[PDB]
Amino acid sequence: SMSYNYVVTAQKPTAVNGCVTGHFTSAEDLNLLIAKNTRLEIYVVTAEGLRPVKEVGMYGKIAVMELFRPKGESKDLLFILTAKYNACILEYKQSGESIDIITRAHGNVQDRIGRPSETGIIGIIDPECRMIGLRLYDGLFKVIPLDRDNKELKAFNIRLEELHVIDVKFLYGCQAPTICFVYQDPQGRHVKTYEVSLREKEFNKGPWKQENVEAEASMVIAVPEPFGGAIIIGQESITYHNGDKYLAIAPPIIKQSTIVCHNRVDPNGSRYLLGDMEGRLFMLLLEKEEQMDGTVTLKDLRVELLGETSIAECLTYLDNGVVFVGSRLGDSQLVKLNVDSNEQGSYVVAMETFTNLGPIVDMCVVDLERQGQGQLVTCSGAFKEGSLRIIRNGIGIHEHASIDLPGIKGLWPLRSDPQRETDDTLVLSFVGQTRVLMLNGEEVEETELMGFVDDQQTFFCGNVAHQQLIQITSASVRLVSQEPKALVSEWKEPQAKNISVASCNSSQVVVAVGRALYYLQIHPQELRQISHTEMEHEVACLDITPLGDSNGLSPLCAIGLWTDISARILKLPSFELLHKEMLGGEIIPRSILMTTFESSHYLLCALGDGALFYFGLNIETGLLSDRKKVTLGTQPTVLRTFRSLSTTNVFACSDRPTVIYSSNHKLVFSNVNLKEVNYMCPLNSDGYPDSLALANNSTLTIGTIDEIQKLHIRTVPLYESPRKICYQEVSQCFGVLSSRIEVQDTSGGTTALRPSASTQALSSSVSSHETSEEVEVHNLLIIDQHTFEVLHAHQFLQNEYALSLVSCKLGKDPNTYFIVGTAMVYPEEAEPKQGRIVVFQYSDGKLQTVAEKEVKGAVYSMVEFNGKLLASINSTVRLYEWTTEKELRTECNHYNNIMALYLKTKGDFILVGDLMRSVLLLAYKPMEGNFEEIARDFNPNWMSAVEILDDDNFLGAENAFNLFVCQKDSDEERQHLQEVGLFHLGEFVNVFCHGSLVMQTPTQGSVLFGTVNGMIGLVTSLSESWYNLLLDMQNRLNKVIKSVGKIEHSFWRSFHTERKTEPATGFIDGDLIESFLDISRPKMQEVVANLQYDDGSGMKREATADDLIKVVEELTRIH
Ligand SMILES: CCOc1cccc([C@@H]2CC(=O)Nc3c2c(C)nn3-c2ccc3nncn3n2)c1
């Protein structure tokens, strides 16, 4: 069992798996809810756009997500079902700034027997909220009655005679709850209804008889009153049914591509949006026919093409012509629908684009810029959405000026013009001195500013009330008129003692002299002394940033003190103590700041040692709450607000410059990708708009900052599907396997749907579902590592699929090659019986074929192996040598596989991942020239990816979203690999690769993985003693953290396939561990009660809160 692993999220899933609108946060709000695997994102729809309210993680994959409103509820409730059959009903509760998702009802609805249906879990709710219906398995329909008594969500099953249901909905306008569904039997596809009897717990005959529908009828729409009835969407037809009523259309406009989603635009069902696999967006329009009895029937159906979106998993109309396009295969979007078409005749205009990395089908890590700074390059998306994505940690700065100028001690922007809205002045402090720089476009020049002194050190200067400037120095506070620039007022301490600390806003000043504080107000031509006090200790730092709807005025003074290392909130003008916090230690506070993020207020206080304490701040009572602490460096941190893209954030200067910001109403910290920064200020001038001034010991820089986020993503559109990637350092390029769909005609020809990377390369060579006829045409792309231009595309043979790709040298040949493994794909073949290995050389802008090898199967995987080429081909693993004639030649073979899909190697060891029989360990035996089977995992697993952790530890991912770790057994029972680690990840892993995105203690090793949902994860190793500590922490965390839907963490992480359910073992959930930094202090104290740790050999010692914070902080830095 001596494998201990830790798995943590580096990038949360980005794919959208579902989306609903309604009134969840309040009756009056319009909400958009988005499901991204295990995450629920809640937004309020505004004219501004989407306002984020709350993101809630759940301990499950979200399979069903629907809003509904029982009689007596003031706003919508939310029904969630997870993939592990956890059902819950949730309520949004907001009290002040505290947001809580409360569980109204919960229970697990898994049955002991059943076959999961082809078109998946379906969950539907009756319009009248009488019941929830679940299609979990073939032949069964599960009913959860919605009585107020049913808090355990007890359910009953009804036998469903139709075994193969495609889609199902509850109908509107029905006296009894009534389902309408499409099902398939040997006689074709059919639409049918049943009423659902709560009394009989059984179906009753439906209100209208069944009809035959199109062979590819796939979606049921329940149309609201006054239409009622159902619309059935197929590939070639749309039909409406309401009993003594049938209407069908066969509009040719839809036949080109499968329609995969729908959404109702109007409450009464007059219009619907439809989306297809080529991102076409249609409007479906229902024309009313009146009747004498006042009912409405359907006169006609029409479909109109509006334009193109991302390929939509889901569409949600948000009012006022705005649509959310939720994409699994490309970026999500907000689009606007216009009444009038544009130039090319589209009614659709993209408003906003949201990054989706998924699916990540392959990836690699390259130090693209600096040595030691790995970046992840993914094969992302599919079809027209396909892309490369380049992911890197930290926030970049774009330097636009650099001036040699040592000894800077402070920076302040100033508008010397009272008319101009932009800064035109940068003021610098030095020891004992001040200098003023004017900004004329890009020119930066020394200048004097009348009223300001140059022979004292400035602690603050800026624009202030009544069209005035202020300069606060060690000697005095100077107030200066704007026109002309004259000294209009000067404040000094009564005996002209030095000012030691300064804080200022537009209308208020607070200065310290040693222990003394003075509060001044800025009036026309007057610095007015209001009040003063003597602090118990010397003053270390001050802030009076006004917060909230305060009209630029602060009733509060934040202060840090020497000696007791206190952060205090004082009232102005009295200086009455509202709150005191002792921060501990013997290192003084250096920087203190009152701040607002996402409409919450905080106090930030940084010590000389790199520690940052932060608290919730009540701006009415002065109360500080829920202390947290991070570490931002080993030097003093200086804090300063700036604005980028209409949000205020805080820049933290230290040896590790950082931006502090908010996400999901919690503070976040992201590294800035710069060396040590001592000082900074925002600067918005004509020549340097929306910019930052930065200083170190020697230099002043002016630049702009990138988006404020943990990870930067660059996108390279390919407009076709990338499949595999490898890096070739000697060529300074990537090789990328890609495929594009073409459409075949009745003769000998196929045609592309659009230009894409493989059709738009600089040069090209050849060898000698998206649509509803289709063929995949595969290519090797050569892409420049700097410009990501497509330099060359090589096209493979007709019906040749490119499966594997490696860049390597072989044998005694100094050249580096791109090598590709393929399969010839024919329709009748269960698996391929033919493939090739092709060795290419990239020289002088083109790919040349150096050698080919015909093999009798699909070449699924290839790896460089000790100067030889290792390949898996159908059920065979084969080692090839590169001969003097530049030909591949078989050395040895292994045959004991079903389908050898995945290879990794380490030394002479080979890890083989099979379609259905898990993993196998081979050794190449150099003195025999053959393989030896060392051990295999005799537990069947349907593999998706493999990795070697070390000589003794083998990591697998399988199709049911689990990880496992195999080891050799601690006889020829040595032939049995032991599954010593098990963990339900809840993602589908396509790729593992050794590497790190962090610039290169508790953990060893770094394995990244990429998933279908665009999630990037990390696996690393732990010692026994570190594992035990972290397991104990998990157990304690799980007793204090309330889970949404009352799902147990242990249940969620349990290994779960069709053959085996077991508790997780040998795996720490780093996402859970990291949440230790987000819990309250009471909870934190609870976790730590009598918690001990082993030190590495025997001795057990107490684990303190503060030491555990440091532990978890270290852990966050591994990604
Ligand atoms: C990376 C930053 O970590 C630490 C930072 C500060 C203090 C500690 C304290 C003391 C210390 O030196 N060790 C320690 C601690 C705590 C809680 N756990 N812990 C273990 C646990 C398992 C283990 N296995 N080998 C060695 N250890 N040390 C840690």
Swiss-Prot record:
The core of the protein consists of three WD40 beta-propeller domains. The keyword Zinc does not apply. Component of the UV-DDB complex which includes DDB1 and DDB2; the heterodimer dimerizes to give rise to a heterotetramer when bound to damaged DNA. The UV-DDB complex interacts with monoubiquitinated histone H2A and binds to XPC via the DDB2 subunit. Component of numerous DCX (DDB1-CUL4-X-box) E3 ubiquitin-protein ligase complexes which consist of a core of DDB1, CUL4A or CUL4B and RBX1. DDB1 may recruit specific substrate targeting subunits to the DCX complex. It is found in: Cytoplasm; Nucleus. Phosphorylated by ABL1. Ubiquitinated by CUL4A. Subsequently degraded by ubiquitin-dependent proteolysis. The lineage of its organism: Eukaryota, Metazoa, Chordata, Craniata, Vertebrata. It is linked to White-Kernohan syndrome: An autosomal dominant disorder characterized by global developmental delay, variably impaired intellectual development, hypotonia, and characteristic facial features. Some patients may have genitourinary and skeletal abnormalities. Residues 14-357 are annotated as: WD repeat beta-propeller A. There is a cross-link at K1100 (Glycyl lysine isopeptide (Lys-Gly) (interchain with G-Cter in SUMO2)). GO terms for molecular function: cullin family protein binding; damaged DNA binding; DNA binding; protein-containing complex binding; protein-macromolecule adaptor activity; ubiquitin ligase complex scaffold activity; WD40-repeat domain binding. Pathway: Protein modification; protein ubiquitination. Changing W562A: Strongly impairs interaction with CUL4A. Belongs to the DDB1 family. Residues 769-1119 are annotated as: Interaction with CDT1 and CUL4A. Pfam families: Beta-prop_RSE1_1st, Beta-prop_RSE1_2nd, CPSF_A. Coiled coil: none annotated. Residues 710-1022 are annotated as: WD repeat beta-propeller C. Protein, which is both involved in DNA repair and protein ubiquitination, as part of the UV-DDB complex and DCX (DDB1-CUL4-X-box) complexes, respectively. Core component of the UV-DDB complex (UV-damaged DNA-binding protein complex), a complex that recognizes UV-induced DNA damage and recruit proteins of the nucleotide excision repair pathway (the NER pathway) to initiate DNA repair. The UV-DDB complex preferentially binds to cyclobutane pyrimidine dimers (CPD), 6-4 photoproducts (6-4 PP), apurinic sites and short mismatches. The modification N-acetylserine is found at S3. This is DNA damage-binding protein 1. It comes from Homo sapiens.
